[PDB]
Amino acid sequence: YDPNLKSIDTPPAVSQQMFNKVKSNGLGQYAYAKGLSSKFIESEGVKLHYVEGGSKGTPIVFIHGFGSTWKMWEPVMLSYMKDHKVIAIDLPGLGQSGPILNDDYSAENTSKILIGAIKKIAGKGPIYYVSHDLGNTASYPLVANNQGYIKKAVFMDSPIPDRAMFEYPGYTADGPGLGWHFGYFSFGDIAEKQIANDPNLFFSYFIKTYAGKKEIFTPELLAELIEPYSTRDKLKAAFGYYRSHADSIRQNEALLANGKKLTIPSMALTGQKGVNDVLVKEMRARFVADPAQYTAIILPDTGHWMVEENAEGVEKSLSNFLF
Amino acid sequence: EYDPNLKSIDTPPAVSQQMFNKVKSNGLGQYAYAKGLSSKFIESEGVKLHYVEGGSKGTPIVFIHGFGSTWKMWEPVMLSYMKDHKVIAIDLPGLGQSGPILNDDYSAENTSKILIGAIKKIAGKGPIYYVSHDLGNTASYPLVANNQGYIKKAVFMDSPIPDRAMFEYPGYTADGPGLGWHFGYFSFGDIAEKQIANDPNLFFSYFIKTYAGKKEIFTPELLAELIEPYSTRDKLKAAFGYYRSHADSIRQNEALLANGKKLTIPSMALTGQKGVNDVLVKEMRARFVADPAQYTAIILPDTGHWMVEENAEGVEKSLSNFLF
């Protein structure tokens, strides 16, 4: 939290002009760099958007989270595609993926949707799997239940839903705590509605609060990052993950109680100025069978939006761990 | 209690604003005082406070509302007691018809200082009984702790008194959004102020019904009356100042508790089973009371956070038995 950060005063109508420009000119989530291919695939009745590059080499699957789309991974995808098949999927309901109509955005359901698509896109495997933010919510069952097919897994910054997610405090001595948004985002359809009235206002403040390098987030970049979350339908989907967290927690806790910890190499890669050490301690204590297979890296001076803020640190950390 | 099936309204903000305008122009809601009651204002530490009083003889009872409320929440209790008691209900600094704390210091110590000055003038030299609800519990602990004797007995209702545990209440629970989440949202820059000002009826209709046990009571017209007082940025800014100031209030109350300034006068935690429930009951017993023999804890069944709206009988009986 930053007591000194100001919220914007941009009129929502002006912000909508910015979002429209992004969509009309194929910028942001719609901009696919040379070598990358935008595609759609149906899985369990859900139309998923994904972007892929490369061909030979162990495939690497990248799953974004809240405030992001496949786009967050583009710099890393570009770096790796000469040596690896790279695949970045928009989570169900977000980016250019369609919604889960029965509102079951729990880890088990999203993992079922994702693995089916991945098996078709990536092929026989094995593959590497890399996740950030809600990606970590969507993915634990997928990873835990497909070890072998998944040869190594990385979770970034955000905690994996577990018992502690019923504990993170709403308020702290430093102001608003890690826990508060888990509550606001699951509080009826209130966040969807309020944020839909002025997405630029909420997200400009939210995104910068969780950034270490705030200067990276110019109004232009923010317009590109917020456009995919600028409508009620996309916000409803996003907040479905939050509504479903209690389900996700029960599901992951059941997995751990049945012994389904990670027995493949895994990494917690976090930003010191982001969620910082929560995921590192969590994975070490509860999710890894053998600490010797576990790597923890906390990037200094780097906030939650790890590739935006430190693409080089992320690429190097991933390369050192995966390859 | 949280109900995942409760629907938010879809009333257009402009239509809601006309509801608010009607409340004000017709003198309803916070502007409506029953026969026997008088609306007055008083300056304390440069802050103009609004209050309503009734009665004359008998131990005075001062009532302090919290978030989502004004003095108005106390009216039925005030009417019930005014025959035998001076009764005084004050709008918290910044809220209802009270003016704001200009330096944004809505910490317990500051609001307690502003309140005690006015109370001494309105209520007289004492002693008095002190009854607090919701943010009243945030505004008032130093007032009560530092003025024991002048305050003969004290009641805190439903909400926790700021202490170290407020740094622990979870944002999320197996039951959905937790007790902690609003403490974060309300102190998250000026975002709550700005978002809620855009459609106060939408936010408060859902918020108020959520924490109600008896939801049917909250008709659109009652909601309009409850929300009108929180329908502008200036009123929301003040409300959320209490939340920005909670870390301060916590330090202040912890310091009082550590300096023995626990409660040595009789005290009561009075809560609603369907509201915050047992948090305050456990908190006061464990940390705020010097002698358990002086402490009463009552949790009203089938009653949510808005305890006088939902169970005036339960509140009056509990206060009467404790106070008298």
Coordinates of C-alpha atoms in Angstrom, one line a residue, chain A residues 108-236:
Chain A
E108 CA -10.7 -28.2 -10.2
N109 CA -13.0 -27.0 -12.9
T110 CA -10.6 -24.5 -14.4
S111 CA -7.8 -27.2 -14.3
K112 CA -10.1 -29.6 -16.2
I113 CA -10.8 -27.0 -18.9
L114 CA -7.1 -26.0 -19.2
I115 CA -5.5 -29.5 -19.3
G116 CA -7.9 -30.6 -22.1
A117 CA -6.9 -27.6 -24.2
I118 CA -3.2 -28.0 -23.3
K119 CA -3.0 -31.7 -24.2
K120 CA -4.4 -30.7 -27.7
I121 CA -2.1 -27.7 -28.2
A122 CA 1.2 -28.9 -26.6
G123 CA 1.0 -32.5 -27.6
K124 CA 2.3 -35.6 -25.8
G125 CA 4.8 -33.8 -23.6
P126 CA 6.4 -33.5 -21.2
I127 CA 5.9 -29.8 -20.8
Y128 CA 6.9 -27.0 -18.4
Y129 CA 4.1 -25.0 -16.7
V130 CA 4.4 -21.4 -15.5
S131 CA 1.6 -19.5 -13.7
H132 CA 1.0 -16.0 -12.2
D133 CA -1.7 -14.5 -9.9
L134 CA -5.1 -16.2 -10.5
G135 CA -3.2 -18.7 -12.7
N136 CA -2.0 -20.1 -9.3
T137 CA -5.7 -20.3 -8.3
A138 CA -6.7 -22.0 -11.6
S139 CA -3.9 -24.5 -11.7
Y140 CA -3.0 -26.5 -8.6
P141 CA -5.1 -29.5 -9.4
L142 CA -3.9 -29.4 -13.1
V143 CA -0.3 -29.6 -11.9
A144 CA -0.7 -32.0 -9.0
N145 CA -2.7 -34.4 -11.0
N146 CA -0.5 -34.4 -14.2
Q147 CA 3.0 -34.7 -12.8
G148 CA 5.1 -36.4 -15.4
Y149 CA 3.2 -34.8 -18.2
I150 CA 4.1 -31.6 -16.4
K151 CA 7.9 -32.0 -15.9
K152 CA 8.5 -28.7 -13.9
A153 CA 6.1 -26.1 -12.6
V154 CA 6.6 -22.4 -11.6
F155 CA 4.0 -20.4 -9.6
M156 CA 4.6 -16.6 -9.5
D157 CA 4.0 -14.1 -6.6
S158 CA 0.4 -14.9 -5.6
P159 CA -0.4 -17.6 -3.0
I160 CA -2.0 -20.9 -4.1
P161 CA -5.4 -21.1 -2.5
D162 CA -5.2 -22.9 0.8
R163 CA -6.3 -22.6 4.4
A164 CA -4.3 -19.4 4.8
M165 CA -6.6 -17.7 2.3
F166 CA -9.3 -17.8 5.0
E167 CA -6.8 -15.9 7.2
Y168 CA -5.0 -13.1 5.2
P169 CA -5.9 -9.9 7.1
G170 CA -8.1 -7.2 5.5
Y171 CA -6.2 -4.5 7.3
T172 CA -2.6 -4.1 8.7
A173 CA -0.4 -1.6 10.4
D174 CA 0.8 -0.6 6.9
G175 CA -2.8 0.0 5.7
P176 CA -5.0 -2.3 3.4
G177 CA -3.8 -5.9 3.7
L178 CA -3.4 -8.8 1.3
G179 CA -6.8 -10.2 2.4
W180 CA -9.1 -7.3 1.6
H181 CA -9.5 -7.8 -2.1
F182 CA -10.4 -11.4 -1.7
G183 CA -13.4 -10.1 0.2
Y184 CA -14.3 -7.1 -2.0
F185 CA -14.1 -9.2 -5.2
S186 CA -16.4 -11.9 -3.8
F187 CA -19.0 -9.4 -2.3
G188 CA -22.0 -10.0 -4.4
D189 CA -21.7 -8.3 -7.9
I190 CA -20.6 -5.1 -6.3
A191 CA -17.0 -4.9 -7.5
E192 CA -18.1 -5.9 -11.1
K193 CA -20.6 -3.1 -11.1
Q194 CA -18.5 -0.4 -9.4
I195 CA -15.4 -1.1 -11.4
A196 CA -17.4 -1.3 -14.6
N197 CA -18.5 2.3 -14.0
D198 CA -14.9 3.5 -14.1
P199 CA -12.3 0.7 -14.8
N200 CA -9.5 3.2 -15.4
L201 CA -9.9 4.7 -12.0
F202 CA -9.9 1.4 -10.1
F203 CA -7.2 -0.4 -12.1
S204 CA -4.8 2.6 -12.4
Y205 CA -4.8 2.7 -8.6
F206 CA -4.9 -1.1 -8.1
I207 CA -2.1 -1.9 -10.6
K208 CA 0.2 0.9 -9.4
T209 CA -0.3 0.0 -5.7
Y210 CA 1.0 -3.5 -6.4
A211 CA 3.8 -2.3 -8.6
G212 CA 7.4 -1.8 -7.4
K213 CA 8.4 0.1 -10.5
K214 CA 5.4 2.4 -10.8
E215 CA 6.8 4.6 -13.5
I216 CA 6.4 1.7 -16.0
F217 CA 2.7 2.1 -15.8
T218 CA 2.0 5.1 -18.0
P219 CA -1.6 6.0 -18.9
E220 CA -1.0 4.4 -22.3
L221 CA 0.2 1.1 -20.9
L222 CA -2.6 1.2 -18.3
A223 CA -5.2 1.7 -21.1
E224 CA -3.9 -1.4 -22.8
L225 CA -3.9 -3.4 -19.5
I226 CA -7.3 -2.3 -18.5
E227 CA -9.2 -2.6 -21.8
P228 CA -9.5 -6.4 -21.4
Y229 CA -11.2 -5.7 -18.0
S230 CA -13.3 -2.8 -19.1
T231 CA -16.7 -4.5 -19.4
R232 CA -19.2 -6.1 -17.0
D233 CA -18.9 -9.5 -18.6
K234 CA -15.1 -9.7 -18.2
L235 CA -15.2 -8.3 -14.6
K236 CA -17.9 -10.9 -13.7

